[PDB]
Design a protein around this ligand. Structure first.
Ligand code: DMA
Ligand code: DMA
Lengths: 199, 178, 200, 184
């Protein structure tokens, strides 16, 4: 029960700030401000009302878990992990003491735990980012999936409650994509000579 | 009517959890995602398959399946004792006698190896004939009366269930004609 | 068994053809031809002796499992999965009938299941390949980890016995590197400001 | 020094029931090395299952005690005491508030007190032997260079309401073991 789990992350629409526009498969999201203009949006307790955030529908209370996100050409983004119990309403600071563990692109710089005091000196534009959780280790880590190089581990934290995948978009009409877990030929006929270059 | 019309009802206890059997147990559709069902021994847990409630032990029987313009489907019979847990190739040797459509226009028989079928008309409705004793299963266009394929002089040693399989999420269900 | 397992693949030196030279951490391997010249090499029923192969020490009898392999240095290679019971002493075709599920590079071509009749028309050089196993599904699949695109799924096969990660080097002097599973800060002091750009 | 002589030399023996599975306790129960990989041991309630820690068998409940630890030229080690009641399952920050009073070395030349927040210690000479002095009643544990007598670090906030075990932690795989000098 020490296996690294490669998570299949699907966004939970009930968490999504109203300016967030999810794809129908809930594996991609963009931010379109005032898209509900002229609408009354019901303000259910799960939804982020100020921070343009969305969570994965998965919760983790134990073990090791990771997923990958495509962030190419998105100028303002946040990825990471947050407690299921985080404040949804108002302008909460996205920091470990409030139950958020993040890597952020902000004004051409990468920032650990969304802090202007932790600029990470990367020598390339991130394209595919690995998000890693080890619950018992208090570990949230980030990876550059181009070379599988370590970027950052947050200070070790007692999670205490279940945690979930966390996403923020701070710019408009710029989608991020959550990379599906590999499934092989799941749900597909495999010809007797094999299946080639499936899409 | 050379052959007894079988009254075929889908056994929800056999349906892969990604399958939805209708209230009347005559039609099956695919869910986006698996339902939360137990893995009882009767359930196909890998193949997207569902059996009829009744199997055949002897005599001559017939039923009809409405496929509509569904892009993907396979139907036929299988032995009581096929592998329901994990993938097994659906072929005579593994206890499956089936044919169908894949990718909107590719008709095959699930033989070892598979064979392509040349069908003048594409069927909206298929008839399945079983003769336990001779050892014959035949597929016809139910409208045209046009032949499709036959397995000949098979040596059945077990009860045979009707079997239905759909991989794709489309709006057309697969429907047993009462 | 719902879960996709990201495997941490460590090579088993007892399986390794004698010309294969493992790294100390056993996560990379190169072929050094006739490197036991003038030596008597002891008998070992686990060891591949006809072809320069080595297995992952892990074996799988169920579930879904994958790992990634860096092949950018190498142009004569085979990777995938084999039965634990495969022939080790005699030379066999590295095909599903003999308990091998492989992607091969040979003479500038990618060959599915090591077959001259299954040339994969790829438009780029592969650098990082994903090897995917779904035991119940009879599924071994290969991905191009550049864009995580599907390359090939082998014909579905009843594995029957435990299967293992499979590696082979042909007329080749460059190393294969098996990408370790991500571990975060496992085994390491994390400062109170976090751990930045950790290098192993 | 008269003050040194107030401290009873403690006879400290490593308790294998407490050792994280990736630790190897020697035959004589005085020495600890790291294995390459966890051994197949039970997760009994006594065992540290996350931190690479091992306790002595005897805990302190009163009085003044001294033990000495050979660190030689190990590049990573941490030692001190911890409460009976510390969290042994999963990561917990080794700090006074969680019931740990330890200092040590990381990265060959970075000496720290494991407090909140961590502090970098100045060690004009790197120690090869560390003297550990515990005064239960004054809640004091002091660390010294046991060869040249120089002071390294003192906690004056040790629990005087909990039994205290010697605790020993190694993360790295290296030739030099961590060794307790028997009381002599
Ligand atoms: C549920 C599923 C994906 C079945 C496909 O089976 P297969 O790959 O053995 O192909 P077929 O039976 O269609 O030839
Ligand atoms: C076993 C292990 C990896 C411990 C390090 O703990 P930590 O990251 O809390 O650091 P430290 O206690 O050395 O400050």
């Amino acid at each position: 029960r020490t296996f690294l789990h490669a998570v299949d992350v699907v966004l939970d629409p009930d968490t999504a700030h109203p300016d967030l526009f999810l794809s129908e498969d809930r594996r991609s999201v963009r931010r379109c401000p005032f898209r509900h203009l002229g609408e009354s949006v019901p303000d259910n307790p799960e939804r982020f009302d100020s921070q343009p955030c969305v969570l994965g529908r998965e919760s983790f209370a134990s073990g090791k878990h990771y997923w990958e996100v495509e962030v190419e050409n998105v100028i303002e983004w946040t990825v990471g992990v947050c407690r299921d119990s985080v404040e949804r309403k108002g302008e909460v600071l996205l920091i470990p003491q409030n139950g958020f563990w993040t890597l952020e692109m902000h004004k051409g710089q990468y920032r650990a735990v969304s802090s202007p005091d932790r600029i990470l000196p990367l020598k390339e534009s991130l394209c595919r980012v690995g998000v890693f959780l080890d619950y018992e280790a208090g570990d949230v880590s980030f990876y550059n999936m181009r070379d599988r190089s370590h970027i950052y581990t947050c200070p070790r934290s007692a999670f205490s409650v279940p945690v979930r995948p966390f996403f923020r978009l701070g710019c408009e009409d710029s989608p991020i994509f959550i990379c599906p877990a590999l499934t092989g030929a799941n749900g597909v006929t495999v010809p007797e000579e094999g299946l080639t270059l499936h899409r | 009517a050379l052959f007894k019309p079988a009254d075929v009802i889908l056994d929800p206890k056999t349906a892969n959890p990604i399958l939805l059997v209708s209230e009347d147990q005559r039609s099956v559709q695919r869910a986006k995602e698996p339902q939360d069902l137990p893995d009882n021994p009767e359930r196909f847990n890998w193949h997207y398959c569902v059996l009829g409630c009744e199997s055949f032990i002897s005599g001559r029987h017939y039923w009809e399946v409405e496929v509509g313009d569904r892009k993907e489907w396979h139907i036929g019979v299988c032995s009581k004792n096929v592998q329901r847990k994990g993938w097994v190739k659906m072929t005579p040797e593994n206890g499956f006698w089936t044919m169908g459509l894949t990718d909107g226009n590719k008709y095959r028989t699930l033989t070892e190896p598979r064979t392509n079928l040349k069908l003048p008309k594409p069927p909206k409705k298929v008839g399945v004939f079983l003769d336990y004793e001779t050892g014959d299963i035949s597929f016809y266009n139910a409208v045209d009366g046009s032949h499709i394929h036959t397995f000949l002089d098979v040596s059945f040693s077990e009860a045979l269930y009707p079997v239905f399989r759909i991989l794709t999420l489309e709006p057309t269900a697969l429907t047993i004609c009462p």
